[PDB]
Design a protein around this ligand. Structure first.
Ligand SMILES: NC(=[NH2+])c1ccc2[nH]c(-c3cc([C@@H](CC(=O)[O-])C(=O)[O-])cc(Br)c3[O-])nc2c1
Ligand SMILES: [Ca+2]
Ligand SMILES: [Cl-]
Length: 223
């Protein structure tokens, strides 16, 4: 996250860290046995880390659980990143409490101007790499479809939306992929891609979760 702030320990209880010997992507806890992340974060040997704040120090509240299976959307296109969503089922359910909690899926999609909270342990530099130890936060508004397509002509599908600042300086970045975009207590997006990080007129692009609620429900119900 570039231009964000330190969230504060366990203030984002649905945020998870996908780990393979190091943090490589974020995710969101939607119930005690399933996590939603981005398809492009897929890999084998994933350990999901819940109740984290500093990812390099065991401070207490952490629950490390192996992924039993990862289900990448069947129509995921790695070239356009269309349908960039993945569900991970945990080997054992997580103990939920105030520090580890799930986030609600939306019933409707959000409108432009809605203010959301984006979080993650991704790079904090737009020009260079600086990874934080603790979770960073950023409040960002959803932009209009016209501004989004103007910024990324021919690359935005109906399953994506832009959130951020056209002036540059505040954005999600590498390491934040797969993590949550929460607006009014509902998971509306998944950090997906962008051109560099926090560059002017190049906002972040997120997977539009409201378009996938039935898929998620059906898939969880049959696995
Ligand atoms: N500006 C943004 N809003 C943004 C958001 C998520 C991103 N995730 C990534 C991302 C980048 C890589 C690198 C690979 C590298 O530098 O070694 C790449 O350019 O392909 C890899 C992953 Br996996 C990402 O999620 N970039 C991102 C940029
Ligand atoms: Ca820790
Ligand atoms: Cl277009």
């Amino acid at each position: 996250i570039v231009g964000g702030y330190t969230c504060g320990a366990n203030t984002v209880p649905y945020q998870v860290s996908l780990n393979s010997g190091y943090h490589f992507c974020g995710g969101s806890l939607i119930n005690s046995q399933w996590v939603v992340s981005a398809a492009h974060c897929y890999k084998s040997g994933i350990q999901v880390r819940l109740g984290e704040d500093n990812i390099n120090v065991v401070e207490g509240n952490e629950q490390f659980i192996s992924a039993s299976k990862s289900i990448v959307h069947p129509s995921y296109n790695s070239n356009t990143l269309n349908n960039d969503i993945m569900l991970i089922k945990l080997k054992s359910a997580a103990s939920l409490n105030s520090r580890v909690a799930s986030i609600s899926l939306p019933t409707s999609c959000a409108s432009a101007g809605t203010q959301c909270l984006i979080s993650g342990w991704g790079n904090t530099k737009s020009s260079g790499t600086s990874y934080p130890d603790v979770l960073k936060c950023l409040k960002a508004p959803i932009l209009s479809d016209s501004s989004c397509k103007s910024a990324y002509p021919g690359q935005i599908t109906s399953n994506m939306f832009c959130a951020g600042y056209l002036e540059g300086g505040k954005d999600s970045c590498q390491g934040d992929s797969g993590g949550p975009v929460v607006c009014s207590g509902k998971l509306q997006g998944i950090v997906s891609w962008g051109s560099g990080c926090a560059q002017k007129n190049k906002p972040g692009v997120y997977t539009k979760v409201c378009n996938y609620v039935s898929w998620i429900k059906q898939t969880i119900a049959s696995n």
